[PDB]
RNA sequence: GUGGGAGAGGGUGGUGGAAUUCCCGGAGUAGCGGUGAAAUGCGCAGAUACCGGGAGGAACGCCGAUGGCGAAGGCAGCCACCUGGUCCACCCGUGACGCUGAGGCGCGAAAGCGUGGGGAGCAAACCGGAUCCGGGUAGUCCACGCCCUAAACGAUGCGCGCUAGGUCUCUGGGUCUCCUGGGGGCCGAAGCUAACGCGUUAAGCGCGCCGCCUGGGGAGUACGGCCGCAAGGCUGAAACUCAAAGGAAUUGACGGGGGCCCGCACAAGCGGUGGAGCAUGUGGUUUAAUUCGAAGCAACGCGAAGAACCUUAC
RNA sequence: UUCCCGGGCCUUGUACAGCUGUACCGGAAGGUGCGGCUGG
């Protein structure tokens, strides 16, 4: 419906879930995907299989809008990063550049108890 | 073992008296208890542990077994069911610590016509010891468990009886339910709310506790200070100094203002 | 190879000579450890300060984005 | 084995053909240690092949052999009490093993009354590229290379 | 005194972005969020993933080290001002002006209190869920006053002199591959120690001064005094009870948790058992008796290598 | 040789993670927040 034909993809790969979102060069998203939309619930949402699926789900709803060329920017340190990468790489799309964009704090806010005890 | 003799001695159990046991377990307690009381009734919950209990108590006939918790049961129903001629009732529960704390209170606000309880607690939380106002042990819990009863620790116990080896020492506390409230109360709800408001921050001054913790408060700075003035309580005195009579008077003051 | 050897004579305290300073930066905007740079203790310490100065001025990146797998 | 490499036994090549593959085949046909019966079955089968199909059955046998020879296999792996059917390379020895094994079981699987005709039909069909053994090989191959995501488990 | 050096030493005044949260716009939307697993909770006034524009708070990612500074507690974004300690070279000046230190005075992590501000994140107590997770007040932050404790430890008081070396590292100076100062570690002469270990940074050989000990529990408790708004801190017993309470190191045991290697142990194969009928042994029943023993592997076609009479023990 | 079973040899903790100052516990055979130490 947009016919931008060339946008950027963002992958938030967390410990518990992986969400992929495609957007125009401007930055207005057109569609996403998530383990949740596939039908998986609970732990299995974090499992890379759901990544293997929402991977191409992005792509499909994107061929749906007639996009061809994609830029991939990944965030987080999820277990299913790399396999999701190879996935939206061979979902039938020409990937230009892939970059890791995991946001780290510059010793700012204090994390959870689970994420303390760092030496 | 054999601590049972001394606990029973401090229970002042008679033949005329009946006994309620909440955590009988293997019935060792009930065993030595049977030789002293005419009526012993035991609340029981563990479906697993019941069959082993049933056969072991066969020698003694004066026992009764009830298969629901103290929480979701009418104790007064049982008292009227079995204790028709009995003069007064004691309680000698020795159940795990994390369960005992609510049930003792629950038996108290309901104001059953029961006289007193002899129960095992941790040394540190012995109904917060003697609840003498100027102490660390003094608390909201103390205020609750002296508003309804007179408590004292008859003795303590190191070592072990049941568990292989614990880390902390234990004590035994003895109770008498009082006939009436300590001092006249305009509301139970307001009184208990005022208690929690005072004890919300122990270290902070009483005035700060009243102003902050109590709802509104900010708009009633002058009012609160004035009422505490007529109460003859100093603003900078802490909650841990005020006693039952004091809190009563303060509660009376705060209402109607 | 170490960065220090494969260079010419330069100044450390000069917080403006950008094209020498970048060669002390990784693909991401991070100061290299002593291993990679092959500098002595004092020169590394002063280099860190110079990096921070030039970096605050906006000549050097707070961070960069690694372009790889 | 924990120390050795379990040296491969060198089979004695067949008499008529002077070939080791034929010896291995007749050995695989064997049941209850009856060598003569298995050899007779094989010889009858190859004679049937010769009558039905013009060319020498030795070549057709060999061609079927490398026809029904796979390259990928899926093996189980036990990590955190889960199954990981990782694909893996097969050595020529292993290739030959499963090839002959599938050929023989498929031969026994046919509904024909006589064993010789069964094995002959299976051999000719496997040479062509149809039958139980062939379909099983593409079965295992398609089971393989379908879970390539598991390839990181080198094992 | 002159000439220089290094440094998260301290105080004051400011600004640099990464990140979290909230708000205002854009586009998009069926779920986000969480555990070993799950459940509370947020969302059609449209959440999370995304882009742009603002607000505010706290901390300073790589460098960062086994590194540095300080008397300790402790101290890391950057700049500027004020300021303490210290080191080296010159061997220029005073001529014992030194060491220690009962009391006093000052400093003193964190937690905690008072008079006011502030509050993003995290979080006692507390509110809920399955029986660790989601929220959440004080607090963590700033200014001024209190509090004065600790595994406040190198479990090692301070100053000076003497007593083999080797190696790594931080920072100075020279006649520069080495020589000579001041710090931080590691092996070790002699020596010391009950042992572990210490060993020019002594726990060695000595001198000077201060503090502290007199068996365990009771007990850092009771009374008294001093301090403090309070919690509490400093000083600090006795009655009574026990014959031990302890420190090192040796041998061994059980599972703590790892390393390694072997076995038809697993795997890779072939043929079996558990389904059927029959033979035999056994449990349990039954009987007058169904003689007796053998009980995970290591009892159960075992004693029994021959029960119609004998064997036979019922 | 990953795993199941059974052994042998060599390594570490208690018997013949812990501790600690403080501040709180109305689900206290102990729990948690702020630190600190190895006497792990």
Solving technique for this entry?
cryo-EM
Question: How far out from the chain centre does Cα B113 lie?
Answer: 15
**In CATH, what is the architecture of A6-115?**
2-Layer Sandwich (3.30)
- Alpha-carbon span B43 to B45, nearest angstrom: 7
Which bases of chain F come closer than 7 Å to a protein CB? 1-3, 23-30, 33
| Tokens 């305009």, located at residue | B186
Asked if A89 and A44 touch (Cβ cutoff 8 Å), the reply is no
| Tokens 């080198």, located at residue | D154
DSSP state of B203: S
Domain chopping of chain A, boundaries: 6-115
The number of C-beta contacts closer than 8 angstroms across A and D is: 3
Using only C-alpha atoms, chain A has a radius of gyration, in whole angstroms, of: 15
Which bases of chain E come closer than 7 Å to a protein CB? 6-8, 16-20, 26-39, 48-52, 57-65, 67, 77-79, 112-115, 120-125, 133-134, 137-138, 169-172, 229-232, 261-263, 265-266, 268-271
Residue D151: list chain A partners with CB under 8 A.
Answer: none
Domain that holds residue D72: 1-155
Q: How many domains does chain D have?
A: 1
Asked if B126 and B172 touch (Cβ cutoff 8 Å), the reply is no
- Chain D contact for A83, CB < 8 A? yes
Across the interface, whether the CB atoms of A98 and C69 are under 8 A apart is answered yes
Encoded tokens for A96? 């230009």
- Alpha-carbon span A38 to A52, nearest angstrom: 11
Domain that holds residue C69: 1-69
Q: What is the resolution of this structure in A?
A: 3.2
Q: How many domains does chain C have?
A: 1
- Alpha helix stretches (DSSP H) within D53-114: 57-67, 92-109
- Alpha-carbon span B184 to B189, nearest angstrom: 13
Encoded tokens for D38? 């298995």
Encoded tokens for D19? 């070939």
Asked if A73 and A11 touch (Cβ cutoff 8 Å), the reply is yes
């Amino acid at each position: 419906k947009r016919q931008v034909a060339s946008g950027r993809a963002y992958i938030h790969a967390s410990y518990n879930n992986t969400i992929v979102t495609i957007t125009d060069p401007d930055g207005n998203p057109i569609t996403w995907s998530s383990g949740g939309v596939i039908g998986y619930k609970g732990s299995r949402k974090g499992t890379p299989y759901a990544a293997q699926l929402a991977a191409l789900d992005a792509a499909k709803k994107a061929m749906a809008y007639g996009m061809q060329s994609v830029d991939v920017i990944v965030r987080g340190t999820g277990a299913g990063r790399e396999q999701a990468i190879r996935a939206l790489q061979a979902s039938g799309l020409q990937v230009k550049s892939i970059v890791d964009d995991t946001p780290v704090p510059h010793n700012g806010c204090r994390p959870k108890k689970k994420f303390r005890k760092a030496s | 073992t054999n601590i049972l003799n001394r606990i029973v001695d401090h229970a002042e159990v008679t033949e005329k008296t009946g006994v309620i046991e909440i955590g009988p377990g293997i019935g060792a307690l009930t065993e030595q208890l049977a030789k002293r009381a005419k009526k012993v009734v035991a609340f029981e919950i563990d479906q697993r542990l019941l069959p082993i209990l049933k056969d072991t108590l066969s020698p003694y006939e004066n026992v009764t077994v009830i298969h629901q918790d103290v929480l979701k049961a009418d104790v007064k129903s049982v008292i009227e069911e079995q204790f028709q001629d009995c003069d007064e009732i004691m309680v000698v529960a020795n159940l795990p610590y994390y369960v005992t704390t609510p049930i003792i209170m629950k038996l108290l606000e309901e104001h059953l016509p029961l006289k007193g309880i002899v129960v095992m607690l941790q040394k540190e939380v012995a109904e917060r010891m003697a609840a003498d106002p100027s102490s660390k042990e003094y608390g909201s819990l103390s205020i609750a468990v002296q508003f309804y009863t007179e408590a004292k620790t008859v003795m303590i116990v190191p070592k072990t009886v049941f568990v292989p080896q614990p880390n902390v020492d234990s004590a035994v506390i003895r109770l008498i339910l009082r006939d009436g409230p300590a001092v006249d109360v305009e509301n139970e709800s307001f009184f208990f709310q005022l208690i929690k408001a005072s004890f919300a921050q122990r270290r902070k001054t009483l005035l700060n506790n009243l102003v902050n913790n109590l709802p509104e408060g900010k708009a009633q700075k002058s009012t609160i200070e004035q009422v505490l003035e007529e109460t003859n309580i100093d603003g900078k005195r802490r909650g841990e100094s005020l006693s039952i009579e004091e809190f009563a008077a303060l509660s009376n003051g705060l209402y109607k203002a | 190879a170490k960065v220090k050897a494969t260079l010419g004579e330069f100044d450390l305290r000069d917080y403006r000579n950008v094209e020498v300073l970048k060669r002390f930066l990784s693909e991401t905007g991070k100061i290299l450890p002593r291993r990679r740079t092959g500098l002595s203790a004092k020169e590394q310490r002063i280099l860190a300060k110079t990096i921070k100065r030039a970096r605050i001025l906006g000549l050097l990146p707070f961070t960069e984005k690694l372009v790889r797998k | 084995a924990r120390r050795r490499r379990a040296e491969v036994r060198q089979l004695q090549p067949d008499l008529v053909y002077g070939d080791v593959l034929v010896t291995a085949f007749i050995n695989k046909i064997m049941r209850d240690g009856k060598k003569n019966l298995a050899a007779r079955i094989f010889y009858d089968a190859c004679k049937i092949i010769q009558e039905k199909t013009g060319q020498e059955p030795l070549k057709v046998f060999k061609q079927a052999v490398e026809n029904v020879k796979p390259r990928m296999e899926v093996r189980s792996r036990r990590v955190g009490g889960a199954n990981y059917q990782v694909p893996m390379e097969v050595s020529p020895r292993r290739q030959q093993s499963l090839a002959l094994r599938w050929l023989v079981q498929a031969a026994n699987q046919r509904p024909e009354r006589r064993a010789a005709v069964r094995i002959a039909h299976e051999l000719m069909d496997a040479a062509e590229g149809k039958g139980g053994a062939v379909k099983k090989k593409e079965d295992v191959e398609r089971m393989a290379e379908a879970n390539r995501a598991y390839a990181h488990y080198r094992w």
